């Protein structure tokens, strides 16, 4: 009931037996013959890239609004998977985002953990455009805001419109999980590869966005540690590439 | 595995193309602008000429379509109540009576097939079979017209398709009506032999293969120069 | 037990919609109002944009219909006896020759499919298949156009459907005829993937997803207030 998961000869994550969300209903898989357009063979690096990339922990404070990571840029420096983003041209990968919190029984709160495919984001100034430096950092989260952002080339980071101009309660349409600290502790979503082409270049394109939004805010009394660490762990699935070359970009 | 039906000979040489735009009036003056005339040759239009000249020997039926739009001429003595315009399009089969001008007997010749078409409905269409003593048309002819190697270098060959003549049938006295003909020629059931290289030099006239010496290809920076190497970024470095 | 065929994806996204109304004259002046032009995009019309933006990836054929009504312009030198108006509607396939103005060679290009339509009968119709290098169109694109993350945030994507250009075929000298085109676009065989939430904020421009922060919903009297409790009657008391 405290079963350990070992993925590759480097990683150990301890976890109890809970519920998973599998994509839009499909497991990640390898490309078959009547699915690709490229003129070569994939040569998938299964022997080295399937492991757990535990990112840094964020602190869910009382006055926090939400965080998002854009993928696959969220593993740009994470080990050999970041090297394959350099020394290739096309790529195709599913992921198994595992999100878990360490709260006591005297804490309360609720999170919504969404995976949004093609989460294109609007700018904080109309009649203007975003830059790539405001969409995502390479490994750290980007914070939503309670009030209105007002920059020139930034993102409209207000929290109830989710950066996309929609209702934040309707993000339940995409693959999601609720971390309710009363009963739930962890959340694990298995995203497949969703695109309109069989393989894309994973520098320009952002495949999906992982958003973690607190709907019921964190409350605690005065004895308690005044934050709850949220730890995200991403494991790539069935990664395969094409176009061996040097690191042309970055 | 894709499909190759887009580049078959039927799908490459069978598209309708406007090959001739002329105009013809309906009242007197000189006896030349009262009718239109087009000798059927695939050499006056360069775009279609280059596609046909990828082959030496061709064999096809014709599918000719006529888009006739008329108008009322300005000036005094206007058309006023004009009832409806009828047009005669005559196909003179090769070696057939050819009209010198309007109101000639050639128009009333039974031998030359004709279409009587009234304005306001679908355009006029006709189909002509493969009309040749030979067994194919030839885009090229390395030879002469007479047996003594005398005459013109490949112009009196049996590659004659005929003529097309169009006039107004009406007898309109008051007012002039100027019509404009558009010929949309199209080959059907094309069979092509002996593929030839695509032409490099531009054409000079539609009776020859004459040309000016042009370069094999465009200028390049150097013997080994690739273009615009990616400037150092955060991935290409 | 009722039926759910009214809310299938075909019955929800396949209705004809007027997406573009333009006008084009038939006589000279500036060389811009003599023809019409519409780049085929489902973003200029907000009502249809919101229905398409309930999905991330779409795949459909097009069914475009053109409602062309002309009129006679006022002033001197009137049309008088105008015979019949013929109009050319040209679909420039993506990456195809595009007309700079009227009487250009792009109009006579064989590559761009065209319809010649005469006034007084049923409207002109054409069907365009799914034309993309990709395997679907994308309503959203979280990415960039160049490989270096440079350019515009999702505008040069392979979501190009082409253009539609309309002009008068006639050569009308006296009088001007002003026609008005209505484009009734309709998708056929729609297949849609990855449902997205319906948009809350209003749109600002048809190249972005930019927005202003709007309320989640409308104002209400209080946290627990039902509306207009029935006033005491002889049953409700």
């Amino acid at each position, epitope marked *: 009931r405290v079963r350990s998961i070992t993925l590759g000869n480097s990683t150990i994550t301890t976890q109890e037996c809970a519920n998973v969300v599998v994509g839009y209903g499909v497991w990640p898989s390898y490309l078959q013959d009547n699915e690709a357009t490229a003129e070569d063979q994939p040569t998938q690096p299964d022997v080295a890239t399937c492991r757990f990339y535990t990112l840094d922990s964020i602190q869910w404070q009382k006055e926090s609004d939400g965080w998002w990571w854009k993928f696959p840029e969220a593993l740009k420096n994470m080990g050999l998977f970041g090297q394959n983003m350099e020394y290739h041209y096309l790529g195709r990968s599913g992921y198994t985002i595992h999100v878990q919190c360490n709260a006591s029984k005297f804490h309360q709160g609720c999170l919504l953990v969404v995976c949004v495919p093609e989460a294109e984001m609007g700018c904080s100034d109309v009649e203007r455009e975003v830059v790539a430096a405001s969409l995502s950092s390479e490994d750290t989260a980007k914070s939503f805001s309670r009030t209105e952002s007002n920059g020139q080339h930034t993102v409209q980071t207000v929290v109830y419109n989710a950066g996309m101009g929609v209702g934040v309660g309707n993000l339940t349409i995409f693959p999601h999980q609720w971390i309710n600290l009363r009963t739930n502790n962890s959340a694990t979503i298995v995203m497949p590869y969703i695109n309109s082409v069989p393989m894309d270049n994973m520098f320009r394109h952002y495949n999906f966005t992982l958003m973690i939004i607190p709907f019921a805010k964190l409350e605690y009394t005065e004895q308690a540690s005044n934050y709850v660490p949220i730890t995200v762990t991403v494991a790539p699935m069935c990664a395969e590439y094409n176009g061996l070359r040097l*690191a042309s970009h*970055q | 595995y894709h499909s190759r039906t887009e580049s078959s000979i039927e799908n490459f040489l069978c598209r309708a193309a406007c090959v001739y735009i002329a105009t013809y009036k309906s009242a007197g003056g000189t006896p030349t602008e009262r009718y239109a005339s087009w000798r059927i040759n695939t050499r006056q239009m360069v775009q279609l000429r280059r596609k046909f000249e990828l082959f030496t020997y061709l064999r096809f039926d014709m599918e000719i379509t006529f888009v006739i739009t008329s108008t009322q001429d300005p000036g005094t003595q206007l058309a006023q109540d004009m009832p409806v315009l009828t047009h005669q399009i005559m196909y003179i089969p090769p070696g057939g009576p050819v009209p010198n001008s309007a109101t000639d007997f050639a128009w009333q010749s039974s031998t030359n097939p004709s279409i009587f078409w009234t304005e306001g409905c679908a355009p006029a269409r006709m189909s002509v079979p493969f009309i040749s003593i030979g067994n194919a048309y030839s885009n090229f002819y390395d030879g002469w017209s007479h047996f003594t190697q005398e005459g013109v270098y490949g112009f009196n060959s049996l590659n004659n398709m005929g003529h097309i003549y169009v006039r107004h049938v009406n007898e309109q006295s008051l007012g002039v009506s100027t019509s404009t003909l558009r010929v949309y020629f199209k080959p059907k059931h094309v069979r092509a032999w002996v593929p030839r290289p695509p032409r490099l030099s531009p054409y000079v006239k539609s009776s020859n293969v004459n040309f000016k010496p042009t370069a094999v290809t465009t200028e390049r920076k150097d013997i080994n120069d690739v273009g*615009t190497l990616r400037p*150092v970024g*955060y991935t290409n470095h | 037990y009722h039926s759910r065929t009214e809310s299938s994806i075909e019955n929800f996204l396949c209705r004809a919609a007027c997406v573009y109304i333009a006008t084009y004259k038939s006589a000279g002046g500036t060389p811009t109002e003599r023809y019409a032009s519409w780049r085929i995009n489902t973003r200029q019309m907000v009502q249809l944009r919101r229905k398409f933006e309930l999905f991330t990836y779409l795949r459909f054929d097009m069914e475009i219909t053109f409602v062309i009504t002309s009129t006679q312009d006022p002033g001197t030198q009137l049309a008088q006896d105008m015979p019949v108006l013929t109009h050319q509607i040209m679909y420039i396939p993506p990456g195809g020759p595009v007309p700079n103005s009227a009487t250009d060679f792009a109009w006579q290009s064989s590559t761009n499919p065209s319809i010649f339509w005469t006034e007084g009968c049923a409207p002109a119709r054409m069907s365009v298949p799914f034309i993309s290098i990709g395997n679907a169109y994308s309503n959203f694109y979280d990415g960039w156009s160049h490989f270096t993350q440079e*350019g515009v945030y999702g505008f040069n994507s392979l979501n190009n459907m082409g253009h539609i250009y309309v002009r008068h075929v006639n050569e009308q000298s006296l009088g001007v005829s002003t026609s008005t085109l209505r484009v009734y676009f309709k998708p056929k065989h729609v297949r849609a993937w990855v449902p997205r939430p319906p948009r809350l904020s209003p749109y600002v421009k048809s190249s972005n997803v930019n927005f202003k922060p709007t309320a989640v919903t409308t104002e209400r009297k209080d946290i627990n207030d039902v509306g207009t409790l029935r006033p005491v009657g002889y049953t409700n008391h």
Partner: antibody, heavy 112, light 114 residues
Framework: LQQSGAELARPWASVKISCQAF???????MQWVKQRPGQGLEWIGT????????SYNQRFKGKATLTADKSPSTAYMQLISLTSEDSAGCFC??????????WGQGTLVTVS | DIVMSQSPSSLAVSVWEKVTMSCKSS????????????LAWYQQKPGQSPKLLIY???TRESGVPDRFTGSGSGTDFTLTISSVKAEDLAVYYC?????????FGAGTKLELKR
């Protein structure tokens, strides 16, 4: 922003120059330029820490070695077989692939 | 190697005289992804370390006047100096971001004439 203090060297020997950057060494490499008072600026090389790459101009290959560690966060350049032609002011600069930005000061190498 | 030319190599000018200076590249330092020229302009004060003047060949820096403005595209550029003052007498070096050997230009020495 910081550079080594003025030092006196001997020909046919090596010199180690230091550079101190307050900014974290990520996504952008450390520039090295050699200034000739008679002529202009000359690039020596850059060591890009974000991907860890090390590169030099052909002229300086075999002359300059570029080495940047993580915990010290100081960039170093070493030159060897010094001659009078190496006496010059050497600057270290940053590059976020957006600009060469600024350089700062630098000890005047004085081979004597 | 991409070389950067500068013409004139130096010129002496008085006060309140609009001066320019060209920096022509042996290769067009303009790529077709963002259309942003890769050229840098630099002022090395007499006996001083150089500072930035114009980056992206188009944009100014802070504490810099409108008598320093980038101008050009492709492979030919210049830096318009509109109203010269007593802080422009120095040597100026252009530079390119494009080819990895980041060579600077010849170096214009804007001289002061009294």
């Amino acid at each position: 922003l910081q550079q080594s203090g003025a030092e006196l060297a001997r020909p046919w020997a090596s010199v180690k120059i230091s550079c101190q950057a307050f900014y974290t060494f990520n996504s952008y490499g450390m520039q090295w330029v050699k200034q000739r008072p008679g002529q202009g600026l000359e690039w020596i090389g850059t060591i890009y820490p974000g991907n860890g790459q090390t590169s030099y101009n052909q002229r300086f290959k075999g002359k300059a070695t570029l080495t940047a560690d993580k915990s010290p966060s100081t960039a170093y350049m070493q030159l060897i077989s010094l001659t009078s032609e190496d006496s010059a002011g050497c600057f270290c600069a940053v590059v976020p692939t957006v600009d060469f930005d600024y350089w700062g000061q630098g000890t005047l190498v004085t081979v004597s | 190697d991409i070389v950067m030319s500068q013409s004139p190599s130096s010129l002496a000018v008085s006060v309140w005289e609009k001066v320019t200076m060209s920096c022509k590249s042996s290769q067009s330092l303009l790529y077709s992804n963002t259309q942003k020229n890769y050229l840098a302009w630099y002022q090395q004060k007499p006996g001083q370390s150089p500072k930035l003047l114009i980056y992206w060949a188009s944009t100014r820096e802070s504490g810099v006047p409108d008598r320093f403005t980038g101008s050009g595209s492709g492979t030919d550029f210049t830096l318009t100096i509109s109203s010269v003052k007593a802080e422009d007498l120095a040597v100026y070096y252009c530079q390119q971001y494009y080819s990895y050997p980041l060579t600077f230009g010849a170096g214009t020495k804007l001289e002061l004439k009294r």
